[PDB]
Each structure stands twice: as structure tokens, then as C-alpha cells.
């Protein structure tokens, strides 16, 4: 539909072009795939960090302790 | 009287007995409901105290909460239907879609 | 960075304590969520050896860690504290995991 | 020592958000993702060679 352009170092363009031709795909497709992978990494890291920070917050601990009462439901 | 929950609703849920209440989003489909008390309805707890993240889409007071809250999709769980106290509201379609995408990532779905 | 070392891994079958009374269950949350702490939530699908098999309850074989033919009650999916996972029982055939994923997709109204 | 590769604007925007999230330039980001791609290509190279050699 619409395409744009990103500036890279020529060495990095060569390495990405390798990776694209290794997988049998276009460079555009490769960068789409790798963008989604980076998104997933950032998302899960955001969750991990948020949860560890929330262990200090006792309102969170109370909340999950209350929700843990359901642990045995339907069994 | 047994609650009639529908997917996308925000409900008040009873914990530890059928004292402690917390809001949750019904995310299981309604084709599963058969009117039993112990049947499991899968919900996502809604928290006003956990910090906001991509896997915790926001939930607005127009959707049934008292204060700005987040849907903790990592806490998705089946609960007995008898724990459903009162319908608090309904989530907008954009919120439901964000919950669906969060759940897809959490459970490794393709 | 996620801890994979002592933590349950997705597709594994683990013995879960649902007290406070243990049951096997399939880990279905991704391992990127794990930080190696005890209070974090791991999403599991309880496995039953007494409930009848249905399309939304894919079967689990002794080759995957159960003692007898069982079913994965995907409708019973639930987040549990990582501390309730006591020991690894086995690993599920990839086809079983794909059936669990499709059952969960239908149960949660996910597209499509 | 610098050029331009063409992506969809959607991919560019997602890469931009990831560059901002990591606090680096999109050039440096694409270097990082290049490394990430190569590592998995390394392991897939071993897996394939193992299948061909069995």
C-alpha cells in the first residue's frame, strides 16, 4: 500500500540482505518479521519488570492472594 | 438466582466464598453456558493498583470500574459461575480486542 | 531477561498443588513471562483422568507424562502462582499442544 | 558508508517505536536485529546440516 525508507550502515544492510536471502524472503518481509519479534520481546520484558516492581506493592499482593482463592474451582 | 454473564461484560466476582470482591472481564464465549452453578467462566481480573503494560490493556470507568484500572490478562483464570455477583458494565470493542491480543501473546497462540 | 532454568516451560506437564490435592496440568503461558520468582503467575490447563473426552478436552497420553489416559480441560484454564508447581511430569506431543491452542482459541472467542 | 533500505511504512513505524523503546537510533536498532537474525540462522544451519547428514 505505502512504503518508506530507512537509513542503515551499508554493512548492516549487507548483513540484513544476507539474512533475507538465507530465509528466501524479501528484505521488507524480514524487517517486518524482526519488528514483530522485537515487539514481543519489549512486551514480555515490560511485563517481567512491572511484576517484579509490583512485588513490593502490597496492594498487589493482597489482590492476587484474594484471587488465589479461586485456584481450586471446578475440580 | 444464577448470574447471566456475557462475554465482554465486567462483573463483580466473589473470592474465597460464593466478603472479597474484585472486578473481572468475562472472556469465555457464551456458547459454553448451560446454567450450572459450578460451571467455569473464564475471566481476566481487573486491577486498579497494578501498573499499566501492553499485556494489561486499560479499562475505563465507562466500562464499569470505579477508577482507572487495567485488565491483567496474565491472571486469566476459570472461575465458578456462582461467584458472579453483579454485572458492572460492558467493555468497548477496542478493549476486548486488546485483551484478545494480550491473551494470544500470553498463551503462545499462532 | 527471563529465567528458563528452574522454571516450568510451555508444553510441559507439571504436578500442580491446588490447595492451600495435586493435579497434573499443561503449562500454556510463554516462558518469556518467567522471572524466576515464586509469586509470578503461570497459566496452566488442568488435566483430568476422570472426565470424558470432548473436542475442547484434547487427550493426554502416558507418553506425555500422565499415569493413565487423561484429558486437558481447556475450559478450566487458570493462572496459578509458580510456587504451586511442584515437579515436572513430562512433555506434550506438539500435536497435543496444537489441539490445546485451538480449543483455547474457541473457548476465548479469539479470531478465528 | 551508509545507504537506505525500503520497508512498509507500518514496519518503519514499528521499528521506530522499538528504537525509541530501546533508546537507540533506527540504524543501530537494525544492526541489533541483524545480529538477532544471524544467531537464529546459525542454529538453523546446524539443524539443517544435521538432518542432511543423517
Swiss-Prot record, chain A:
Cysteine pairs bridged by disulfides in the record: none
GO MF term (any one): DNA binding
Coiled-coil residue spans: none
Region (Disordered): 48-75
Keyword Nucleus included in the entry's annotation: no
Keyword tags: DNA-binding, Toxin-antitoxin system
A single BP term in Gene Ontology: positive regulation of growth
Stated role: Antitoxin component of a type II toxin-antitoxin (TA) system. Upon expression in E.coli but not in M.smegmatis neutralizes the effect of cognate toxin MazF7.
Subunit-structure text: Forms a complex with cognate toxin MazF7.
Protein name in UniProt: Antitoxin MazE7
UniProt source species: Mycobacterium tuberculosis (strain ATCC 25618 / H37Rv)
Underlying gene: mazE7
Curated annotation (Swiss-Prot), chain C:
SS bond partners: none
Coiled coil: none
Molecular functions per Gene Ontology: DNA binding; RNA endonuclease activity
Organism: Mycobacterium tuberculosis (strain ATCC 25618 / H37Rv)
Subunit structure: Forms a complex with cognate antitoxin MazE7.
Full-protein residues shown: 1 to 115 of 136
The organism's place on the tree of life at top rank: Bacteria
EC code(s) of this entry: 3.1.-.-
Job description of the protein: Toxic component of a type II toxin-antitoxin (TA) system. Upon expression in E.coli and M.smegmatis inhibits cell growth and colony formation. Its toxic effect is neutralized by coexpression with cognate antitoxin MazE7. Probably an endoribonuclease.
Family affiliation: Belongs to the PemK/MazF family.
Name of the protein in its database record: Probable endoribonuclease MazF7
GO BP, sorted A to Z: mRNA catabolic process; negative regulation of growth; negative regulation of translation; rRNA catabolic process; symbiont-mediated perturbation of host process
Enzyme class: hydrolase
Keyword Chloroplast: no
Keywords of the record: Endonuclease, Hydrolase, Nuclease, Toxin-antitoxin system
Amino acid at each position: 500500500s505505502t512504503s518508506t525508507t530507512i537509513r542503515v550502515s551499508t554493512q548492516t544492510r549487507d548483513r540484513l540482505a544476507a539474512q533475507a536471502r538465507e530465509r528466501g524472503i524479501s528484505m521488507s518481509a524480514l524487517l517486518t518479521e524482526l519488528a514483530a519479534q522485537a515487539e514481543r520481546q519489549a512486551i514480555f520484558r515490560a511485563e517481567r519488570e512491572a511484576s517484579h516492581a509490583e512485588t513490593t506493592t502490597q496492594a498487589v499482593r493482597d489482590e492476587d492472594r484474594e484471587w488465589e482463592g479461586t485456584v481450586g474451582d471446578g475440580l | 438466582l444464577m448470574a447471566e454473564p456475557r462475554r465482554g461484560d465486567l462483573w463483580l466476582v466473589s473470592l474465597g466464598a460464593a466478603g472479597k470482591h474484585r472486578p473481572a472481564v468475562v472472556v469465555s464465549v457464551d456458547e459454553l453456558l448451560t446454567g450450572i452453578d459450578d460451571e467455569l467462566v473464564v475471566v481476566v481480573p481487573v486491577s486498579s493498583s497494578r501498573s499499566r503494560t501492553p499485556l494489561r490493556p486499560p479499562v475505563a470507568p465507562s466500562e464499569g470500574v470505579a477508577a482507572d484500572s487495567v485488565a491483567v490478562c496474565r491472571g486469566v483464570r476459570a472461575v465458578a459461575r456462582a461467584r458472579l455477583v453483579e454485572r458492572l458494565g460492558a467493555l468497548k470493542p477496542a478493549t476486548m480486542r486488546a485483551i484478545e491480543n494480550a491473551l494470544t501473546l500470553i498463551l503462545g497462540l499462532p
